[model samples]
Target: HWGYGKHNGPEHWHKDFPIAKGERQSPVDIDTHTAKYDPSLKPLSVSYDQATSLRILNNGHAFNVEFDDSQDKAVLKGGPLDGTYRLIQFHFHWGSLDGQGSEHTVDKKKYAAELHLVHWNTKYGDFGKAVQQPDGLAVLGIFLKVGSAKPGLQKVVDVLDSIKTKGKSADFTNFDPRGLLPESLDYWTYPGSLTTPPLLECVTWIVLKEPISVSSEQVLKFRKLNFNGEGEPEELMVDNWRPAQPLKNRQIKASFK
Candidate 1:
């Protein structure tokens, strides 16, 4: 469950979580040349301290993190914030060795990885309860592309040795959620459903157009996270990213202008 496996990958997730089918998913391969920029859209602002309980959790799938936004981190403002939403758990999507790493493929081309920043409406009381409501979730999608030759995953590489084995993960000490935000908040926003399950119809999608860089070696590390369900490890779960779903009737709003 640490990450990567046959049944554990996206191809199998839908079997256990049926709701995933209708989720409004992204990472769709876009023809950057055809993409038009609009000035009306802007990145939503939030207090810097809006994240608490920001630590790593080995949820058998990958490392999931949870943070708090109730007290000190709940007040800052400047950008187009929709109000303070608490940072919930964060997770990742990656690819196998030699395969494309991107979960949302634009025109069928896969990238290296996709990092999801999951948040919940502060009005939802708690994560469990809030996630059930339509307005309870906000997910930020960041693409991780392979570039540098060094360990591209310096952020989490130090801890990789600990999880080197399968179905294993340890708390990655001393890390904050905000530290992961791209320097450029320039992003795309839309009223869509969850990208994962039940494909709930109540999510605000904020897909950052700016991609973060990772080294080719780091990409290799992600490919190592295999799946071992039940007791035996079958099928390498790396590169399990899903292809980009349709936009339906939605017109993606952007802040590049």
Candidate 2:
């Protein structure tokens, strides 16, 4: 179906998912010169309850570390969002080459990888309902540069061997996602849709200004993930990112000057 292949990649997406060409598509190239600094933007808040971590799984597209929707909650608030949004899952997109992997680039500079922390607006009641609303979802995007390995990220990579193929999963708990954030909470935000299909235009995208470090060796493991199932022609799930879309005049506002 929908995937990152020559036939089904982003170029072919607009055929199946018309919203792919919509005004608010995500992962736009941020021309830093045009990024306006706003004093009104507040520091984003992340409060995760370690007990709420659920499991990590491969969905044939990206490997996701899902958190329990216990209402026991890991919340993200402030900074562009009107109300509270609960953390549901966190995922990654990377390039096999390691030279250009991040979904959102800064001033045409691409990073080795990207992390998306997804949350749903509490006001929407359920994730299903939320994904369709204008203010329903908030995705925090963080770029990953190849450097010294991050202890927080290493914990996540450590479990990759168990869930090598699509649909495979393993229990993953007692983790704090905030540990993966860059030292600075400074960010840039705008209205956008999901990078992948069904490119719903319901997201409030918050992309961090600073990138955190991950070792080249650590990022190489992401290339080992299988896009196919147990016996479906052996495809590795690398380059699982969409190219930057046209901005369509959407303003890029920053929390930092």
Candidate 3:
């Protein structure tokens, strides 16, 4: 019923999903000059168990790597979070066009792609219920630039061939997500919502400053995915990103000076 097309894209999202026009929306433009730097912000603490990774699936949106969140095997703490948030899944957003893929832009410049690592706070018990609360979800956003090929990402890229179509999934195990992060922990954060519907205003967005590298060839591979399920007219799964929403009265906080 909803998608990233001229008829059902971000511009028309508000028609059905009213929250698309809500105050605390995501994919906002990061204006560095106006971002308030806070020295008191604690350094981010991330812990992940590679063995917890279960499988990867092409959910007609992007390739999402699911994790075993039954236990605290993989969790994130500190750096704007009150309690530990368990890693549930990680996905990416990209476009076929150059310099226009990333959902969140830094200093008005877009990257080749963006990665979203979604977690649910343990305090709320489970992800399904937690997603309904105000401070229940945390999404770590990493910008992907076209430069040196990232060896760590090769494993993820290799599996795209098998799950090129929507509704297809493959057994993906023993993958460590920590390897995908940048060297520096510097980031920008704000209160926002899920980029897609119900566009829930339950996320605390932590967007990294340094972009990880991926070759142009690797990025183009993302365009190979199809948006429709089996038996449907195969539509290229490109431009899955939602447009940046208004900042309103929100303040962008910087974790570094």
Candidate 4:
């Protein structure tokens, strides 16, 4: 029922989820000029165990590659986070077209797509408990553009072929996630919430400054992901990104000067 259609889209989300309009809501426009350079913020440390990758699934919303989070095998520490966060799953949000897709934009410029690497703070014990705390979750935001193909993304895209229908899953192992990151780890961070439903105000967002390249053909593969509703007709899932929310009183801190 909560599909990206006009009837149950982001605009109508606030009726059911009042926190949709909360102060710390995420996917805000990153106007680089306004962000302050904070020397205090430490550089991000990303360590992903290639073997930690378990499976890829069409999770109804978007395609996600889940990792084995039983332990902190793939973890992200530092960079505006109070404690280390464990990587649980990574998913993407994109538009029907290549011109626009990113949830978080830089200087009002939209990328072809956006990838979110969802992580939870170890201090909170588990995902459920973590989502309720202020510093419970940390998500890495990476932008994707239509250009030279990314070998890192191609590996994941290849698995998309089998998961055309929602809820369909396939085994995806031995994949190193670090290949998805841009060379420059410089980022802008702020306290924010998950962009999707439930919209819990718990995430510490670390959005990378650089955009990664994926071929135009690669993105078409993403558009083919089916939105198989329980009793509804099957349709392609696209334009799955939420618009940039109001900034309110939050200040974004940049890692680079």
Task: Report how far off residue 74 is in candidate 1 (Å).
Answer: 7.3
lDDT of each: 0.59, 0.90, 0.90, 0.91
- Cα RMSD of all models vs. native, in order, equals 3.9, 1.0, 1.0, 1.3
Model 4, 1-257: lDDT tens per residue? 67688888899889889999999998999999999999999999898854398899888889889899999799999988877899999999998998899999999999999999999999988999999999999999999999999998889888887888887899998888988999999999999999998999999999999999999989999998887844558788899999999999899999999
Overlapping backbone residue pairs in candidate 4 total 0
Residues 1-257, model 1: lDDT tens digits:
21234445455656666655553544455544444576654546745453455445444445565555455353322232465565666677776643566665544556677888777776767667766776676777777777754332466756654554345656654455565566687766656665554456666766677777778777676555444433565444465556666666556656676
Tell me the TM-score of each prediction against the true structure.
0.77, 0.97, 0.97, 0.97
The CA root-mean-square deviation of candidate 2, after full C-alpha superposition on the true structure, stands at 1.0
Off by over 4 Å in 1: 1-18, 21-38, 46-54, 68-81, 97-99, 106-109, 149-155, 164-169, 229-231
Model 4: residue 182 alpha-carbon error in angstroms: 0.6
Give candidate 4 regions above 4 Å deviation. Answer: 229-232
Candidate 3 global lDDT = 0.90
Instruction: After the best TM-score superposition of candidate 3, give how far the Cα of residue 78 lies from its true spot, in angstroms.
Output: 0.4
In candidate 1, position 110 carries an lDDT of 61
Candidate 2 — which residues are off by over 4 angstroms?
49-51
38-77: candidate 2 lDDT, tens digit per residue: 9999889877754377899999999999998759478889
